């Protein structure tokens, strides 16, 4: 029953980051998750100290609700088109062990097949910009919903154009018609310093997609916590949690 969990694609500078954190803490949010877009052309890996939130923010974000300390997550969104770049991401399962939730973005149907079949990821990114048609096979979706794969739908087409709005709503209606709507969570991107709307109306932005009259909000509020759970069971251990506790 953990609400207020979305995925943000936002890094420009510290000032815009502080503004987005203050805006999210003001409106309705209690967990901020920052994505980092990495494409297949650059192939860069800077994982050790790239962001450093706690050394630069001031000790607490204050919200209007229960006034609880906001947990801040650092996630990685990897755009993967080539199959060799997917093999590079296969090589990163033992070399560098950070970035609690690993989010792959597929473009090839064979690569999307082996992503749901063999490749150990947390949440598959599905965004459609500038004419990307894609078919859906149902038994890997069944293995995905049996495993725990929550499908990410990162949306921000309303700010730039309207054709991008059309392709996103068409791909989302196709996803809701084929995937049947078991675990699909939607999230907003942040390039401009104000690209966030109300938290209760994200439920209707998912209800325009479909998925239920109420289990859209119930499914995002359950499956984002289940996504943090899946990332934690990938990070710590698959059945064990070992934490150093020195009182």
């Amino acid at each position: 029953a953990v609400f207020a969990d979305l995925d943000l694609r936002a890094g420009s500078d510290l000032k815009a980051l502080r503004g987005l954190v203050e805006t999210a803490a003001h409106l309705g949010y209690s967990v901020v998750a920052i994505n980092h877009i990495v494409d297949f052309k650059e192939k860069k890996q800077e994982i050790e100290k790239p962001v450093a939130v706690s050394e630069l923010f001031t000790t607490l974000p204050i919200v209007q609700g229960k006034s609880r300390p906001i947990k801040i997550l650092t996630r990685l969104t990897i755009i993967v088109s080539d199959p060799s770049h997917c093999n590079v991401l296969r090589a990163t399962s033992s070399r560098a062990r950070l970035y609690d939730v690993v989010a792959v973005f597929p473009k090839t149907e064979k690569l999307f097949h082996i992503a749901c079949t063999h490749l150990d990821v947390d949440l598959v990114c599905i965004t459609v910009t500038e004419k990307l048609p894609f078919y859906f096979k149902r038994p890997p979706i069944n293995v995905a919903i049996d495993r725990g794969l929550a499908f990410e739908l990162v949306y921000s087409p309303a700010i730039k154009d309207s054709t991008m709005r059309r392709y996103t709503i068409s791909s989302a209606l196709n996803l809701m018609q084929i995937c049947k709507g078991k675990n699909v969570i939607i999230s907003s991107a942040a390039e401009r310093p104000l690209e966030i709307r109300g938290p209760y109306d994200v439920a209707n932005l998912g209800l325009l997609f479909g998925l239920s009259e109420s289990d859209a909000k119930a499914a995002v509020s359950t499956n984002c916590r289940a996504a943090l759970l899946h990332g934690e069971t990938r990070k710590t251990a698959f059945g064990i949690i070992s934490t150093v506790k020195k009182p």
Partner: protein, 147 residues
Amino acid sequence: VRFKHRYLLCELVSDDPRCRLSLDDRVLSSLVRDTIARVHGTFGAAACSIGFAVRYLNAYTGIVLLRCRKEFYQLVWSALPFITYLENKGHRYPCFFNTLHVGGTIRTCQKFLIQYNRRQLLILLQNCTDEGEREAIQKSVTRSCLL
């Protein structure tokens, strides 16, 4: 593993058979998308970008068979009467009219098209009373009886 498709027949009713000769798949698709974009927004027109497509077209006959989804055929068939003002090389005013809505099932849709064509042949006969068309009618009846 499948999706229940719906189909629809529409007759273009107009004189001046340059309008009958002015038909194309891309032009009709862009026309229907542009006239839905005036009536419906992104949610209505973009569902027609993935679900709606041109399927069967005849130039001289003017019968158009189109596809449409289960959760969107009401929106498509409500967007059909608002197809107005086709601007082209001439000053034309074409307009669609629905014959009957067939729930998918292309085979009986082609069956109903044959009876509609026979009704369009046989009723036009007595009011005209001309032998030059009547000879072609007799040839068409003979060729249909050879089938």
